[PDB]
């Protein structure tokens, strides 16, 4: 028997919505260690001989995400269900519901790791966005709130 705050997970986001979430999220990769290093050597070769705006990426640290929700800066928050200590993330759907930040439980922790240059991530969030994907993001917010939140209003109940 599962106490309602556990198994608020497993009632995860479905097939098509999850695919569309990654269609958005895979656009916003953090610049990998190799890519970042080569860019700075390009900067070294250029600026030593002879401007840029703030670049948007996903935010992916548990401490960083728990900061961003309640900041409030997070817009979408993805949460993996499979976590070795489950108690690490059990409060997080409640925190998002309380602060009114739209969240989604995604399926697979390594699935979050792929979009983020890590092995696993447990939580991923998209704070800010480029102007072109703004309408698409807000549409996905409504899509997730209709599919995830409104269908499973009774997820806080039932063992």
């Amino acid at each position: 028997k599962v106490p309602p705050t556990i198994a608020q997970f497993q009632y995860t986001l479905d097939r098509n919505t999850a695919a569309e979430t990654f269609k958005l999220f895979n656009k916003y990769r953090p610049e990998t260690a190799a890519e970042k290093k080569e860019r700075l050597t390009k900067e070294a070769a250029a600026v030593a001989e002879g401007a840029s705006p703030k670049p948007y990426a996903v935010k992916y640290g548990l401490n960083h995400v728990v900061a961003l929700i309640e900041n409030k800066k997070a817009k979408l928050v993805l949460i993996a269900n499979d976590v070795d200590p489950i108690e690490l993330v059990v409060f997080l759907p409640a925190l998002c519901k309380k602060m009114g930040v739209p969240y989604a439980i995604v399926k697979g922790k390594a699935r979050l790791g792929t979009l983020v240059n890590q092995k696993t991530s447990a939580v991923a969030a998209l704070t800010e966005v480029r102007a072109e994907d703004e309408a698409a993001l807000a549409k996905l917010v409504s899509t997730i709130d209709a599919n995830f939140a409104d269908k499973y209003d009774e997820v806080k109940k039932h063992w």
């Binding site: 895979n26 990769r29 990998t32 190799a34 890519e35 792929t114 979009l115 240059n117």
Partner: protein, 312 residues
């Protein structure tokens, strides 16, 4: 001796890469010579197949993830194994190399006349046609020919590369029906072995006897015929065969394949002029026609068999 099932377990490499390595040294079961496999396990090519396998796990986790940016990095920072240090163990003396180059050109002249498939990469093929015309560049330059033999199979050749009568069957220029039986894994690895072998020899024939290796090519002659008249060459007799066709300017015509036949006349010394080049001083025209038409007095009209009769 040891067992064929033992050595793969012993070497702990791929069985194909066992077969791929076994071509490289030239090891044959008399059963497997046990010292020789123990001789094999300390060899730098064995370093690479383990590394080429562990490249492949590290790459498919890359594209599997979806970071193609990181996936692309793996290739540019990826070595190739050379087969230089399979050669000097195997070909101690260069005159021993030229008595095994018999089979080498016998493979590699086949592969130029091949359609590119999924099984065979065209880069190999476009090297093979390049290496053939690199081979024929030196042979036609310093006139090094002795004997010819056109037959049903292909066209044999014979030449004293510092006196050893090499013999290399050029097949006929046609589409070749690739049979389902054959294996282009074993044969390609021979080509892979033979290709690098053929580089050093052509370096050797140029940079010690003749010219610079490799000479540049001429593109616009390659647009016409793509054979031996292109691929121009720059540095930096005793036989009557080498004295044949000395200032005997020929015209060749569209009946014969010029590629098989411009080679010999340039190996002798006569000049070759084709019908095909557009797409007088000549005094011969080779024709295979029941109906000949022009028939000038200056040109001497000989069917090309007699040219092969001139060589033998």
């Amino acid at each position: 001796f040891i067992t064929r099932s033992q050595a793969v377990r012993k070497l702990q490499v791929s069985l194909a890469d066992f077969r791929r390595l076994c071509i490289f040294k030239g090891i044959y079961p008399r059963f497997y010579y046990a010292k020789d496999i123990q001789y094999l396990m300390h060899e730098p090519v064995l370093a690479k197949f383990r590394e080429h396998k562990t490249f492949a796990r590290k790459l498919t986790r890359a594209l599997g993830r979806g970071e193609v940016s990181s996936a692309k990095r793996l290739e540019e920072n990826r070595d190739s194994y050379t087969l230089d240090h399979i050669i000097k163990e195997r070909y101690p003396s260069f005159p021993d190399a030229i008595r095994d180059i018999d089979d080498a050109l016998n493979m590699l002249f086949l592969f130029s006349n091949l359609p590119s498939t999924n099984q065979v990469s065209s880069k190999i093929i476009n090297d093979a046609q390049k290496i053939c015309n690199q081979w024929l560049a030196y042979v036609a330059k310093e006139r090094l020919v002795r004997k010819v033999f056109v037959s049903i199979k292909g066209v044999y050749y014979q030449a004293n590369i510092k006196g050893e009568e090499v013999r290399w069957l050029v097949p006929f220029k046609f589409p070749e029906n690739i049979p389902s039986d054959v294996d282009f894994r074993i044969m390609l690895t021979f080509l892979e072995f033979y290709s690098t072998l053929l580089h050093f020899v052509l370096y050797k024939l140029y940079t010690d006897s003749g010219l610079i290796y490799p000479p540049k090519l001429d593109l616009k002659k390659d647009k016409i015929i793509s054979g031996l008249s292109s691929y121009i060459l720059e540095s930096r007799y005793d036989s009557p065969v080498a004295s044949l066709f000395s200032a005997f300017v020929f015209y060749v015509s569209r009946e014969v394949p010029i590629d098989i036949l411009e080679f010999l006349i340039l190996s002798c010394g006569g000049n070759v002029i084709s019908e095909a080049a557009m797409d007088s001083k000549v005094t011969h025209q080779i024709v295979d026609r029941p109906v000949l038409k022009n028939k000038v007095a200056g040109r001497t009209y000989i069917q090309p068999q007699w040219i092969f009769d001139c060589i033998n």
